[PDB]
Structures are given as structure tokens and as C-alpha cells.
Symmetry: D2
Subunit: 338 residues, 4 copies
Amino acid sequence: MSLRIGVIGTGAIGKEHINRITNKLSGAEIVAVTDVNQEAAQKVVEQYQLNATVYPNDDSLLADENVDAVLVTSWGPAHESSVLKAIKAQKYVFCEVPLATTAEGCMRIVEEEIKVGKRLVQVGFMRRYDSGYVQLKEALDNHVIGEPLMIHCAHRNPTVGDNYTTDMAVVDTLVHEIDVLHWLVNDDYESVQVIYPKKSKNALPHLKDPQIVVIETKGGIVINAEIYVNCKYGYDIQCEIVGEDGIIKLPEPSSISLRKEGRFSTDILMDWQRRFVAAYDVEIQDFIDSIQKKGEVSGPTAWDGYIAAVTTDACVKAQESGQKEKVELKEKPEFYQS
Amino acid sequence: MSLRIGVIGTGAIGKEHINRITNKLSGAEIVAVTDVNQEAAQKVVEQYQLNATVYPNDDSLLADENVDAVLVTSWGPAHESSVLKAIKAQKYVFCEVPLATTAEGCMRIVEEEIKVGKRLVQVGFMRRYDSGYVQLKEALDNHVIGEPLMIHCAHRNPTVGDNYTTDMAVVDTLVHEIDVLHWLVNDDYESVQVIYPKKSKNALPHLKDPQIVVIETKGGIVINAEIYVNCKYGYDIQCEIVGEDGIIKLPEPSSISLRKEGRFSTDILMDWQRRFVAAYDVEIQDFIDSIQKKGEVSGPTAWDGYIAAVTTDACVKAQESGQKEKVELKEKPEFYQS
Amino acid sequence: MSLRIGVIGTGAIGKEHINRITNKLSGAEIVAVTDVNQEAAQKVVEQYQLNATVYPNDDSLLADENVDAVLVTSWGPAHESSVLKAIKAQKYVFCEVPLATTAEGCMRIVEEEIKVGKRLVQVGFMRRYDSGYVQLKEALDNHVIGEPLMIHCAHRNPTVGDNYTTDMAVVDTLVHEIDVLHWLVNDDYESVQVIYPKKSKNALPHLKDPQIVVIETKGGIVINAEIYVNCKYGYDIQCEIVGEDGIIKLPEPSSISLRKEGRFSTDILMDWQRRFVAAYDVEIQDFIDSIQKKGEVSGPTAWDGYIAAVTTDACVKAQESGQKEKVELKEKPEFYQS
Amino acid sequence: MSLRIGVIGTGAIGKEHINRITNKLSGAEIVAVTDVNQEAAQKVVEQYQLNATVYPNDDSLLADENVDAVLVTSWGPAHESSVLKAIKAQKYVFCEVPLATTAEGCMRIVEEEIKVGKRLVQVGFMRRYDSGYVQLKEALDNHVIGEPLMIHCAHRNPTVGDNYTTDMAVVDTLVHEIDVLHWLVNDDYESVQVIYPKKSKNALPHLKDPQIVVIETKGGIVINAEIYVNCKYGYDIQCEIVGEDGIIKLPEPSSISLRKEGRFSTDILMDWQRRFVAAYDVEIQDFIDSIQKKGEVSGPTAWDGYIAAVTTDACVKAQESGQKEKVELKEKPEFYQS
């Protein structure tokens, strides 16, 4: 029996997930949609040739007893409301980043989920499903390099639009690093500090770019995360983990090599949408498969969403203060302990 | 509407394809199976929880008007018979390598398909769907290196069983190179010659390993293909194409790097079944999608199967003779021209 | 006419330079030596078969009118005294690191040299002559990456002895990075801060290792320098410079690659004495050649020694304080301006 | 005491060696020169400020009892005559490639040297002193990959002049591979065969380029050597040795890496004169040092010159015949056995 999925929010993000579920992945079907703009939802049902009911809002969609699970892919600030409604309707939910805009919002979700007795919520941190990050996690789990001590990472983007602001470097961009790193080393964040190098000619007058975020974990791991969103040369993710006895490093995306006109070279991606395509497929397939096999979801958790929200807020605070800011995290509930 | 697929031959190969269709890919369902050993087919239906009819033979399966397409994954020498039956029953067919065991067998299939007026047969040369080979093809199509002049490639395997014989290096192993290279450079083979270096200590007394196959295309491209099936260190595919003005090269499979105990290193796969997993998925998804969108298949063709059979026979002849042997190919029909 | 060189200090360092001058390089001869322990100097004259006078002290050696130039390779704290004596005797001088132990000591040398009207002093920062660093400097001079914005570097060592202390990570080890970086980007240091990750199991109880030093230049370049002197895996120098429009990176020392037992790998050096052998040769040959061609030396200057001493002191201060410490540098004299 | 060296032939090659001996290396001096054009020799003495006697011919230079050793850097076909004269005058001799133009000429030299009772002749195959080739030799000597089975190598050049002819690809260019490979694997050549791919647009009508030379050793190692002298992209030497249990490969010349405009890249040299600069220095320093320490030379031998001459002749024969040609080598004398 195919998992029957309703989609809340049919913009670009929702459309891509609908496409993968309908045309690429196994074991599920889109049976319902809703968008703030009903005309857009109807258009999407036609665009993708869905056998799907269009609902005026998420309450009515969630009341459809033929809906087993939902994707929350609406406007970012609206995610939290739908997640809470889904947990109350006892439906599984895949929520695109962010889970909620504040630590308090994530806590509301956490408290409601912990009542359910099983995991309903998976948050869309797709990097955990990227084959490179999976290999890193495997090496760490096997103690290949001894205790991790330091992490050097970078998130670089060729250019950004006029609307991209300083806070977004952490809130929209670094949030992915924020999730993946504490997962990799099984250690929680203690503090963050932001340092601004000289501003790049490639950045608009209002934007502070590049920036360096220094994050320390409770166990003493020191992370220096470079964010440079106008680096011109490409879209580029780098991550190196220095352990006691060795060093592991995320690979480049696969590319044929070229010898030509005095250079030996490989491609660097220009389009961020080409970097993690496979991970988005695998994360949604895991959502489907875990529900079918286990009756509960298995990816990044509501708690991970909480960690990200708390840490993002602290980074933005540090962007403004110039001081080292504490990351104040509640103790992780046994409900979320591996 | 899902494509309704029948499977002819439910051994290890058939089981893997059934698994991908049922659990990984989109747009198709296994509705029927048959195996020489009916008990094995029944077991597979139960193993994979299929809603599928077990037929005693391929004729009865092909007579099921609810079957739209078939996979031919039986014993190698039996492939040809099922392919011919499917073409006569006017069903689309995906045939695992080889299409047929002789040039004449492939010609029988070709002559029958060319009557149909559309392409029914796709042959399982999965390498054409590997992202690395796709990148190579793109560079060549874009004339990045000018005219290809020479190709240096290698197919290496850690060790083989007692039953692996000299002819199999070409028939089972090099056949994949044989298909992919002429596709890459759009040029047909003219001659082959086999040279034996000193025998490896890692090979059994009966096996000639390693070997070098030199293949020349009608256009004058010279290919030197190394086959070494007891190389001990890993499973390894290498391909470098030297053009007039530059050189392109297939990448290593993606791997984190490690600095440890005086070495900077990446993984080499040990298991050949881990090398092309993604390509098998993509090739079958293409079979499904092309039938749905175009009403005809789009992968390697019956003609490609013919080329492989003719070329494999010539290589085996050269293994025995020590001389340069002609690859005698009929002119490619307009039916198969891009 | 060969340059006639006297050596002040015939320990291990002095012996290596004597060896290169006598057995490897062109245009100079060792005509005189002195060591605190006369017996050791005499032994060295015999060991290397020198036609050289043994002097009881540097004053008597410097009074030898057949001495054109001196190497100062004595005990570190004793360097300054010999350098001042040589400048007064108007002899060219190559001084091993450090020029002097304090900013004030380097200033004494600077003030005396600036009177001479030509450059007499070259300081032994050999990295500027390493082919990799030379390539980096060339790219930067040619504006290949636009303005440098950030530098990520590392100085790693397999293990250290019981006597190696926390301050030495900066004074003995990072001093080389300290010299090379400001030279690369033509920008002076403004501040330093030290951050301690969790201590490595590989470090002795008294040693803080690893450490991260964050250095900001007056122009706004941010440098994060990792020092890890018990990394176990090898001796390893890494340097990446992120500019506005691209990124350049120091290469690995040259090594054949190996495919074996499931790994594709290159060597990492274990012995720090194998990393910069060529640079030591080239730096001394430059000392010889510049004196012969220009009548003045051309390498790292007394001023560079001053920068290093001031910066090293500030790092050690920051190691203790945990705060960001200012690097207070006098304005660079026109005497030292390119 | 410096080794007193006379130079026979003061063209471009002789001038470079004179420069390295006079300005770069240790332990020797140029005390005499001769060139067919006396005016050119005199000019060179002035150009390099030598304290050197100009002799009208090699006989008079060799009669100078203050000459300890000679370099033979004259016109290629004239090398043999000077080498024989030097052996008769009992002087050490460094001979640029080729030792002689025919197997018979090399044999004349061999027979005369074997009378001397010690090695006088070193042939200028500088690749044996390149750090990459030295590393390859070390791995092989240590049995890192088990028995060598196959070698894949390439000698590529960006473009050649109008005067460059088909035979020169082997005689001038591949001769270096010819020397280095049999040295690497300690195995002598048995046969050669030449195969011509389609001609490159980059080659002139008279030149066959590229070409592939297949060489088999007596022990059964199979070598495929690609020569492509109009490859446009750079000057490039590649060498991969496939052994029973692993594979070793010559590294790229060291280069910083660059991320810029969608590419991650390293430099490829354009100028062949930049590839082996260090090896030329080391080979001449070895000539000097071995004579001083051992009273006999230690590099590539007169016998190696013989092997090269015999093998080059066989390659040129195969270029013309299209058949596999024998490499007919006399048994190596105990005089030349390690």
C-alpha cells in the first residue's frame, strides 16, 4: 500500500518534492494539496497530473482520513503552525527547514511530539543523507581518527541577490552546517563568535560578506566556519575534521578531469541546486520507508530543529555584538536519544 | 498508469531488478514472473511481496495482455529466445547482457525489430548511464578536446573464482568497455589484437591474466584496454581519452580522504557490485520513462548488442590466434541512426 | 672570487649550513669558525675537511680581514650579540631564526643597520624560497584571486619531546607562518587571539596542544592558524588563501601515488627535516649570489625579524590572557621598503 | 681540490652545463673548452667569466694534463669520437645523449672502457635523477607492488617545428623513456612494435603524430608508450607501473591549486626545459661527487647508451615496417653489473 501524502505549500520547494515523489521515488502518492493561493495549488495538481484533492487550508487537508503523512513546504514562518496541527492530527510530518523560527516555537513542537510516544516529525536537513557526509559519519563512528578536535568548514556561493542580508548568512545558509556538524561528532554547541574579514568587492554595500563563525562544542571541539556568499568562482562546500590521530575530508562532487591549455582541472558547480540533488531523493525515500517499516520516522528530529533554531539565534546575536555568545540548550530528552 | 512489467528469469540479476522496480523507482509494477524453476519464481513473489502471477514459461507470460513490458534476466544463452518472443508479442523488452551469444543471433533480433517500426529493445549496458561516462560523453559532444585520437582504459578486479576462464575476460568483463567506447566516440571498431604480459602470481594456472586488448576504430582511434582480474588491490575502472587538443578522464568513485600514519588516501572499492549501483537504477528508470513519454525505448539498442557480440567474438579469436583480427560489422541500419 | 664565510656557532644547524656551502652550493668557502666550545669547532673543521681558522670568539673571527660574511648559527639567545658585532665590523650576515629574542633587540639591530646605507642582514626564514610559496607569491602579485580576504593554514608535527612547552608552539613553530604570511599578502598584523580546543591524548599533561591562533592584519585579512604538534600522522604544512574571486593553495610535497589494498594514496613526510631541504639550499645561494652581484643581501630582512619578534611576543601574551592582543609595530622604515 | 673539467662543444647544451658547474654546483671548475667554431668557444669563456684555456680541438684539450674530466656536448653524431679519445686519454667523461649513433659505435666505446678496469663514462640520461623516478625505483626495489607486469607511459609536447620528423619521436624524444624503463624494472627489451592512430590536425603533413610504441621485455613486461608531440595543452610526462598487487605512478610537477571561474586546477608546464631542471643539476653533481669519493663514475653507463642505441634503431625499423621487430642485445658484461 502506497503512503498517502498531503502537501502543505505548493511553491517551488513543494513542487520539487511533489515531482520526486510522483516521478522518481517508490512507495508513496500525493493525494492532497493546499496552498495559501488556491489557484496555485490547483495549477500544480494539473501540472503534475495528480489524482489529488485541493483543500482550502491545512486543517481541512489534515482532517482527510485518507491522508497518512504531510510535507510542510509553506512559507518559512508558517511551518510551525502546520507541524503542530499535524502532530495533533497524529500524522507523520516532513518539515522543510526551519522547523520553527524561534527556540520557543521548536519547544512547543517538541513538547507535543514527546506525548505521542513515537517519532512523527522529520526535519529537512538533507545533508545527513549526502554520500560524502555519510562516509564522514562512518569514519567517525569507527574511530578512524580518534577524538575529533577541530573542524574547518566553508559554505561558498558565487553571488547573491540584492535582498540577501547579513543575518541570512547564518539563518538560511550556515543552518545546514549547524545541523550537520553536531550530528557528525555527537557533541552539542556551547558558544559562537563572529569575525568579519575585510568586505569583498563582490558584496553589496549593506551585506557583511565574507564572515567567519567560530563555534565551540561542550566537549571542546573548535569549529571555524567560513561563509562567503559572493565568492564568484562557484558553489562550494568544504569540511575537514581534524582528530587526534588523523584527518578526514569531504570529497569534491564527482567530475571528469581535463588537461587543456596549460591546466589540469575538474569542474566546480555553479548552481547550488546541483549539489545535493541525490540527498533530497534519499531523505524523502527514508521518510517513506521508515514509516512503512517501523511506523515512525528516522531522520533529523524535532530536537535537531530546536538545536538549529537556538544556535542560529545565537549566531545572529554574535553578528551584532561582536562578542562570544552562549548557546543555551535544554537537556536532550530521552525521547530523542539514539 | 504504472507500466506493468513481467520478469523472465528470477535469479540474482532478476531479483535485483525486481527490488529496484518495487522498492526504489517510479512508474512501474511487477505483475508477472517466470523462471525455469517455478519454485524459485514463487519464492521470489513471496520474498518481495509482489501482486504477481507466476507463469510456467515465457510464452504464457507474454500472452498475458496485462503485461506491457518484460525484463529478460534469464540464463545468458537463453536471452535471445525470449527477446524474439517479446518482439513478436509486441512488448517492450529490457535485455540483460548479452542480447544474444552470436552475431547471427543478434541479427535475428535486429531483423525482427526493424519490422516493428519503433524501438522495443533496450540492452543492459548500464555504463552509459553512469554520471562519469555521461560527463565524458558531454565533453566529447561539445568538442572540448577536438578529435579523439587514443583511449587508455583498464578493467581491474581483485580476484576471480576457479571457474573464471581466459575467454571470460572479454566475453563477461571487457564487453562493457566494448559497448561504452564506440558510443563515446561515435566510431565503429575495425580490428582487435590481444597481447599477454607475464602471468600474475595471483592468477590460477589455467587463466591468462592480465591481458591487453588493442582495438582500432574505422576512423583511426587506437584503444589499449588492460584487463587484470586478479589485481588484488580493488575493483577499478579507468578510462582516459586523448584528443587533439586535450585529455579527459573518468573520475574515481567519490570518497572522503584520510591523512593517517604517513599516508594521504582515498578508498578504492573492493566489491564490483558497489561501482555502478546508481547506473542500474537510472537505466531502468529510463526504460520506464521513455516508454511512458515516447512509446518507445531509448537506451543501448539491439544494434549495440550486435556490435558487442561481433566484437567479443573477434577478441576471443585474437586471444587464440595472437594475430590482429578484423571486426566485421554490417552497416548500421537507418532504424538505429540517431 | 669565492665569498669567504665565517661561521659563528658550530652545532647541528651550523654544521648543516657548512655542509651545504662546502659540498652543495656555488661561489663561497668556509674560511673561519668559532663555537663557545672550541673543541667542537675544531672537530667540525676536521669533520668537513675545511681550510679554516678556529677562533676563540666572534670578535676575533670578525677582526679577520679575510672574512667577507658570517653565518650566525649559535644558541638562539646569543644571535643578537653577534649580529650587532657583524654590522659594526661591516660584514654581511645571515642570521638563523630568531634575529633577536625581543622586539627591542631587533630594534637595536635595525637602528644600526639603517646607518650602513645598504642591507647587511638576511634572516633565515627559508619558507620564502620554497617553490610552493614562491608560486603562491607569484599568483598574488599577479592578482589572480583579487584581494586576499582570509587565510587558512596549519603546522602539524607527529610528536614532540618532553621539553616542548606551550609557548614554543608559537616561538619555535608558528614563527615561520608568522614571517611568510605577511610577506605573501603585503599586509601587517594588527591583532592575535589564541583558542584552545580539547587537549589531544597525544600531548603531555603540561602542553596545550592543539591550538588555534587567529591573526588579523591591518587591512582586514583574517588568518586562522592551526598548530598541532602531536598529530601522529606526519609532518604537514597547509596554507590556503581565499581571495575575492578565487582560492590558491600550497601543494603537497611531491610523491608517487600508490593503489594497494583498497587505498589510493600518496606519502606524507614524517620528518620535518625533509620538508624544506631545497629552500635552505636556495636561501643560502641567494645570500651568496646577491652579495656578489649587488653588494648587498636580498632575503628576509632585519625588519622581518622585528615583525616576527613582536608578533611572537603578542601570541605568547594571548596564550596566557585568553584575550585578543594588539600587535604593536613601529612604522616600516623606507630603508626596508621594496 | 676542485675537479678540473674541460668542455667539448659549447653550444646551448654545453653552455647550460658550464653555467650549472660554474654558478650552481659544488666541487668542480671549467678549466678548458673547445668548439668546432673557435670564436664561439672564446665568446663562452668571456660570457661566463671562466679562467679557461680555449683549445682548437678535443685532442689538444685532452692532452692538457690539468684536465681531469670532460663533458661531451658537441653535435650528436660527433659524440662517439670524443668519448673514445677521452677513454684513451684515461679521463672521466660525461656524454650527453646519445653515446653514439649506432649500436656498433656504442660497442666500440664499451670494448675500450672495459679495458680500463673502472668506469669512466656516464651518459646524460637525467631522468634517473628526477625525484619522482627515484621514488618509483625505491618502491620497486622494495617490492611494494610485487612483480611489475605492465607499464603505461606518455611523452607529450605542445608543438614541434617544421624540421621535426617521424623518426625523431623515437630517436630524440622516446629515447629517455627507453633508458628509464629498463632501469626501473631491471629487465631488458625483447621486441618493439609501432602503431599509428589517426593523425592529429596539429601535426604537419610530413609527420606521423601521435604514435604508440609497444615494447615487451625479456621477462614479459608489456609497455605501451604514447608519443604525442603536438598535443597543444602542455609538456607532459606520465608513467604508471602496474604490478601484481598494486600500481605506482609518477607525480605531476608541483603546483599550487586554483579555484576560479568554475574550475579547480593545477598548472601544466608548457616548456620542456622546465621539467627536469633539478635532475640535470643532480646528475652532474653525482658525476663530480662519485669521481671525488670513488675514483669512478656512477650514473647511466656506456652499456645503457648501447641499449638505447639498439632499441632506438629497432623502433625506427618498426616505424617503417609496421611489424614487431626484435631488439637484439648482446649479453650485459660483468663490468656493468651492479
